Design a protein around this motif. Sequence first.
Motif, PDB file in Angstrom:
ATOM      1  N   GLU A  14       0.862  -1.171   0.000  1.00 21.53           N
ATOM      2  CA  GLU A  14       0.000   0.000   0.000  1.00 21.53           C
ATOM      3  C   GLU A  14       0.898   1.220   0.000  1.00 21.53           C
ATOM      4  OE1 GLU A  14      -3.226   0.701  -0.174  1.00 21.53           O
ATOM      5  OE2 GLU A  14      -3.827  -1.388  -0.465  1.00 21.53           O
ATOM      6  N   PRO A  15       0.349   2.408  -0.262  1.00 16.22           N
ATOM      7  CA  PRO A  15       1.192   3.607  -0.266  1.00 16.22           C
ATOM      8  C   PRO A  15       1.909   3.785   1.061  1.00 16.22           C
ATOM      9  CG  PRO A  15      -0.923   4.104  -1.240  1.00 16.22           C
ATOM     10  CD  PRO A  15      -1.021   2.702  -0.719  1.00 16.22           C
ATOM     11  N   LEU A  16       3.117   4.336   0.985  1.00 16.62           N
ATOM     12  CA  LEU A  16       3.995   4.504   2.137  1.00 16.62           C
ATOM     13  C   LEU A  16       4.296   5.986   2.289  1.00 16.62           C
ATOM     14  CD1 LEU A  16       5.761   3.527   4.406  1.00 16.62           C
ATOM     15  CD2 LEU A  16       7.425   2.708   2.742  1.00 16.62           C
ATOM     16  N   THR A  17       3.944   6.548   3.444  1.00 17.25           N
ATOM     17  CA  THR A  17       3.986   7.989   3.653  1.00 17.25           C
ATOM     18  C   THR A  17       4.571   8.312   5.019  1.00 17.25           C
ATOM     19  OG1 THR A  17       2.710  10.039   3.487  1.00 17.25           O
ATOM     20  CG2 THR A  17       1.738   8.222   4.730  1.00 17.25           C
ATOM     21  N   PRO A  32      10.707  13.542   2.787  1.00 16.36           N
ATOM     22  CA  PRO A  32      12.047  14.120   2.669  1.00 16.36           C
ATOM     23  C   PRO A  32      12.687  13.643   1.376  1.00 16.36           C
ATOM     24  CG  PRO A  32      12.103  12.316   4.204  1.00 16.36           C
ATOM     25  CD  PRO A  32      10.655  12.525   3.851  1.00 16.36           C
ATOM     26  N   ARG A  33      13.512  14.499   0.777  1.00 17.85           N
ATOM     27  CA  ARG A  33      13.878  14.329  -0.621  1.00 17.85           C
ATOM     28  C   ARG A  33      15.286  13.783  -0.827  1.00 17.85           C
ATOM     29  NH1 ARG A  33       9.570  13.901  -3.208  1.00 17.85           N
ATOM     30  NH2 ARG A  33      10.631  14.605  -5.108  1.00 17.85           N
ATOM     31  N   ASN A  34      15.922  13.252   0.215  1.00 13.27           N
ATOM     32  CA  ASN A  34      17.240  12.623   0.090  1.00 13.27           C
ATOM     33  C   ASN A  34      18.241  13.573  -0.556  1.00 13.27           C
ATOM     34  OD1 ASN A  34      19.297  10.400  -1.277  1.00 13.27           O
ATOM     35  ND2 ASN A  34      18.337   9.687   0.619  1.00 13.27           N
ATOM     36  N   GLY A  35      18.157  14.839  -0.207  1.00 14.50           N
ATOM     37  CA  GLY A  35      18.985  15.837  -0.842  1.00 14.50           C
ATOM     38  C   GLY A  35      18.227  17.152  -0.938  1.00 14.50           C
ATOM     39  N   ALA A  40      15.419  12.534  -5.278  1.00 18.99           N
ATOM     40  CA  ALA A  40      14.497  11.416  -5.121  1.00 18.99           C
ATOM     41  C   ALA A  40      14.149  11.210  -3.647  1.00 18.99           C
ATOM     42  CB  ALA A  40      15.111  10.140  -5.693  1.00 18.99           C
ATOM     43  N   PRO A  41      12.871  11.080  -3.288  1.00 15.15           N
ATOM     44  CA  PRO A  41      12.526  10.942  -1.871  1.00 15.15           C
ATOM     45  C   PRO A  41      12.932   9.596  -1.302  1.00 15.15           C
ATOM     46  CG  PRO A  41      10.577  10.617  -3.175  1.00 15.15           C
ATOM     47  CD  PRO A  41      11.676  10.959  -4.142  1.00 15.15           C
ATOM     48  N   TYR A  42      13.056   9.575   0.023  1.00 17.62           N
ATOM     49  CA  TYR A  42      13.364   8.371   0.774  1.00 17.62           C
ATOM     50  C   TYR A  42      12.452   8.299   1.986  1.00 17.62           C
ATOM     51  CZ  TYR A  42      15.618  11.170   4.372  1.00 17.62           C
ATOM     52  OH  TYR A  42      15.878  12.076   5.373  1.00 17.62           O
ATOM     53  N   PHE A  43      12.093   7.086   2.372  1.00 16.82           N
ATOM     54  CA  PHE A  43      11.397   6.923   3.638  1.00 16.82           C
ATOM     55  C   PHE A  43      12.400   7.077   4.778  1.00 16.82           C
ATOM     56  CE2 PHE A  43       8.969   4.833   6.984  1.00 16.82           C
ATOM     57  CZ  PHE A  43       7.745   5.421   6.779  1.00 16.82           C
ATOM     58  N   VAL A 125      21.764  -1.400  17.176  1.00 18.82           N
ATOM     59  CA  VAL A 125      20.993  -1.502  15.943  1.00 18.82           C
ATOM     60  C   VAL A 125      20.950  -0.138  15.271  1.00 18.82           C
ATOM     61  CG1 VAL A 125      18.649  -0.969  16.778  1.00 18.82           C
ATOM     62  CG2 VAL A 125      18.987  -2.629  14.946  1.00 18.82           C
ATOM     63  N   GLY A 126      21.290  -0.111  13.989  1.00 20.05           N
ATOM     64  CA  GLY A 126      21.195   1.083  13.179  1.00 20.05           C
ATOM     65  C   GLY A 126      20.354   0.793  11.958  1.00 20.05           C
ATOM     66  N   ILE A 127      19.219   1.470  11.823  1.00 20.46           N
ATOM     67  CA  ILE A 127      18.281   1.222  10.737  1.00 20.46           C
ATOM     68  C   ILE A 127      18.450   2.331   9.712  1.00 20.46           C
ATOM     69  CG2 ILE A 127      15.896   0.804  10.078  1.00 20.46           C
ATOM     70  CD1 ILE A 127      17.162   0.578  13.719  1.00 20.46           C
ATOM     71  N   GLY A 128      18.830   1.956   8.495  1.00 20.97           N
ATOM     72  CA  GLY A 128      19.056   2.927   7.453  1.00 20.97           C
ATOM     73  C   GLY A 128      17.770   3.409   6.824  1.00 20.97           C
ATOM     74  N   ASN A 129      17.929   4.355   5.910  1.00 18.48           N
ATOM     75  CA  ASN A 129      16.809   4.873   5.150  1.00 18.48           C
ATOM     76  C   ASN A 129      16.381   3.878   4.081  1.00 18.48           C
ATOM     77  OD1 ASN A 129      16.896   7.223   6.642  1.00 18.48           O
ATOM     78  ND2 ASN A 129      18.136   8.324   5.133  1.00 18.48           N
ATOM     79  N   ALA A 130      15.106   3.942   3.714  1.00 22.44           N
ATOM     80  CA  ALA A 130      14.575   3.180   2.593  1.00 22.44           C
ATOM     81  C   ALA A 130      14.511   4.116   1.396  1.00 22.44           C
ATOM     82  CB  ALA A 130      13.195   2.609   2.911  1.00 22.44           C
ATOM     83  N   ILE A 131      15.207   3.751   0.324  1.00 24.15           N
ATOM     84  CA  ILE A 131      15.359   4.592  -0.855  1.00 24.15           C
ATOM     85  C   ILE A 131      14.800   3.822  -2.044  1.00 24.15           C
ATOM     86  CG2 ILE A 131      16.997   5.678  -2.448  1.00 24.15           C
ATOM     87  CD1 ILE A 131      18.775   5.685   0.328  1.00 24.15           C
ATOM     88  N   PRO A 132      13.909   4.403  -2.851  1.00 26.27           N
ATOM     89  CA  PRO A 132      13.364   3.650  -3.985  1.00 26.27           C
ATOM     90  C   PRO A 132      14.450   3.275  -4.978  1.00 26.27           C
ATOM     91  CG  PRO A 132      12.783   5.953  -4.170  1.00 26.27           C
ATOM     92  CD  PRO A 132      13.351   5.766  -2.806  1.00 26.27           C
TER      93      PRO A 132
END
Lengths: 342, 335, 208
Positions: A14-17, A32-35, A40-43, A125-132
């Motif tokens: 489903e959509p991720l926001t 947020p736009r990863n820059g 390109a946005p990232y979760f 634990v280090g959780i990174g960003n999700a990038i399309p």
Amino acid sequence: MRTLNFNGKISTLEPLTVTVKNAVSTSGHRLPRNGGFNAAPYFPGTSIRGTLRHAAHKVIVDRVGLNADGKSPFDLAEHFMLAQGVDINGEAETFAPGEINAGAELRSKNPLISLFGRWGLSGKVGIGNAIPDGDNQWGMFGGGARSIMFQRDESLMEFLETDQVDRLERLLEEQAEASVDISQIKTEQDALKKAMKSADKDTKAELQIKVRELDEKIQARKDQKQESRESIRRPIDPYEAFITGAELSHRMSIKNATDEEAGLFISALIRFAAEPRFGGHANHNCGLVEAHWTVTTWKPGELVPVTLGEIVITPNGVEITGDELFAMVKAFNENQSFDFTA
Amino acid sequence: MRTLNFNGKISTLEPLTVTVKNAVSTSGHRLPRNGGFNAAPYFPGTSIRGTLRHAAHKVIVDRVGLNADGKSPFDLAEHFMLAQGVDINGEAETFAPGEINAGAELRSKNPLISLFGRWGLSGKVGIGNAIPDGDNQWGMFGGGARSIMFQRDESLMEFLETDQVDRLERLLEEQAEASVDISQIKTEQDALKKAMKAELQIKVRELDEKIQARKDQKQESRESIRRPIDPYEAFITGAELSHRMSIKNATDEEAGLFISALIRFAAEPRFGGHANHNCGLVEAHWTVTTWKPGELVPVTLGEIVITPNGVEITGDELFAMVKAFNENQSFDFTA
Amino acid sequence: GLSGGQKGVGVSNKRREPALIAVNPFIGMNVGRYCTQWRSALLTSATLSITSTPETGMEWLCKALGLTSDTISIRKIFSPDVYGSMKLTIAGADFPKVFNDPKEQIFSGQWLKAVVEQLSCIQGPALVLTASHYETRMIANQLGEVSQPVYIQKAGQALSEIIKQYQEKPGILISAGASVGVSPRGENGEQIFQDLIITRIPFLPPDR
RNA sequence: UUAUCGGCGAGACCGGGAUGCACCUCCCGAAGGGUCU
DNA sequence: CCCTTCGGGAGGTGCATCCCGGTCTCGCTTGGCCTCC
DNA sequence: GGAGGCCAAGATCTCAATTTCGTACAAGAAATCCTTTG
């Protein structure tokens, strides 16, 4: 104690926001736009990390168990420490010399706090960003318009009394008159707001003052309204979210992960898979994900990693591959020597 | 106290359309796209959620019943809070101290608001978007043009009076004149648009106001009759749309209310709009699956199939939920 | 596109067709090859020298056409000792900033007001040379009749029309950057602009 | 250019914690029809 | 060879952290003392 | 026994506190436009 890197991909069923305060602006909800703006946005890794931290907290709550009425032994301060790392009791230093070595015992007896750190203690634990992976994997979703029920459907009018019908009449009349008044206020105030762009810096303060008093005038116009406070008829602005089926590359790392700490993290992933929801707009069922991660270890000094296994979270179930991950989960489940009330 | 995930498909009995404000541009009505102009259009979760919320509201008022004259005991603020989620009286606020732990009692007393939430109260029900399974399965429907009835079939000339016949002839001639004038002025507007700034926009607004005034200089027939109808995008009949809803941490009462709302929606299975063209009619089947947190796999509690022939419910869990919601007399929706 | 030069959007001169323009990044030296093909070529211009020093103010052609030391035969700057008379008026440092926010191309109201005032202080025919047509528009809107006939170069309008119209009736002539090597003659060879007003230096925009 | 000549250099992890989320149906109306082995 | 509609309306609020810990040097000459030759 | 090297000791004292480039432009031609239209 070994490093485990969960490298994998998250598909968006489903959509991720998400709504990050710095990311959002006056334009509207934006990821947020990863820059820069057009990047390109990232979760955010923050929302993922918080979601998994709450999942781990619930895992620990269930592991400790609840008394007959269903309450947890943990104090509220302990709940906050575990899931959000806030010591409301009001003592957690960082450079406490006596706490130099208490970190090791605290981590051993509190696998969750070791995994997800706290103020003064690093988080393993280090959780990174999700990038399309691809492009155009995001867009505006959920836009709409809140309408008046009795105007969309007339069968709801036979449910209201005559006095209540009069109340709705007054509501709609107040809506129309206050809305035209507010529209006039909005048009004049944006008329002078566009003069901000070419204005003397000294006059910019006066322009800001005038805008602020016009906003206060808007608030007063809404306050004098009696039937309603906020307008029933309104376009709901859409929010920026990743498309359904969007594939986001995701990276996590448990640094120097003990068997029990990695097992707790995997149990957190499993319990999260029950409600695989990331981010916001639960209404519209945003956040459902199908994530698969390959867990790779890397003994320091070695030239290549070793793939311990794969964690696949799907709506049909959670598949754990590799004997090492099963061993970690079993070790965490069978270790009764944890004290989370530290 | 379980989280129920309804995963399934919505087949389209008649074309399914929705006019999302951001989606539709001046180019034409377009279905809300799943990212960019070229992605696969989806039906918004918002429209499905609103339809099922209104269905649940009608379920609740029916269960509460009506008086002898047939009036619901609720008031306007209560009606809006139930189905619309808006506090007419303004007695709602988020992150308010004192409301802490009023969530459980409020949800138990008001299952509907527990499901769909209110301003500041998280809604347990999340209604995902409808994603078509295959490619295509969307297109432009509607179209056509309103036309002057009187030039199509002539038996109406025997119905109309001579004065009304003169009125009709004046209408036709004046609409032809307005049509040529508007065509000329719109061609001028298009040429000016092709020319290219704020002054240009002001001139465009003035020209549009002049067009509106010309349409106001119309004794009888201000709106053109023989006018084309802009087509609306929709999903084709038989389009299979994958659909996902989830009640997060749902009681037996809340889930039962949701299934009752599903039945009442299946009474009139309409989604979106263009109800004039019978658009929105859908038959949907959803596997309801729960997932005990900590367990590795979910268990299918049952299946709900919506069809014009009827609503099938299988799995004793869903029957138990419906019976629990119906039997529970301890709901207080007038909060 | 990416390898070298500038990208842009084009509208073909005939049929007005959309296009995506790119720059050939290796035909820059082909023109130099073409010039050297001639037995002896001479590039001469009135503004070819950025500076007054020949061997440091000429590298723009040395690099643009790719000319290395093989093709630098002579680099000399020749200017007349005395040719005409030039009085200079300048905006000091305290003069208002041109752009309040140049990123969105917003001219500060203070600077526009000062430019309007100074233009209104002129007493003879004058040639205002703006950089942008937007700036032309803004100064024209803020400025009014100052007892001197105003003339404007509309965006895309060939300068011949405006110059011919302004010749018979001299006065204020605002011209944008479209005019690069065309000066308004007085129709008999006499100067018809005692004042040449450069509102702002035509700074080029950043090329990210 | 009032003389002559002269590298300032070597070492340091700044890091440690946080779900931004919570509510909205965008719908309302139309026959595109008629002419020719 | 027609003729392209109206406008409705555009949020309310939260909350914005704590703390470390800021270096040696040396820009000269001489004798006393240590080992070296 | 002398003759290189390494270290310690020798007088009190010099003054001063810092903040972020440039904004918008486009002429007469082989062209490929072209290829028409047919």
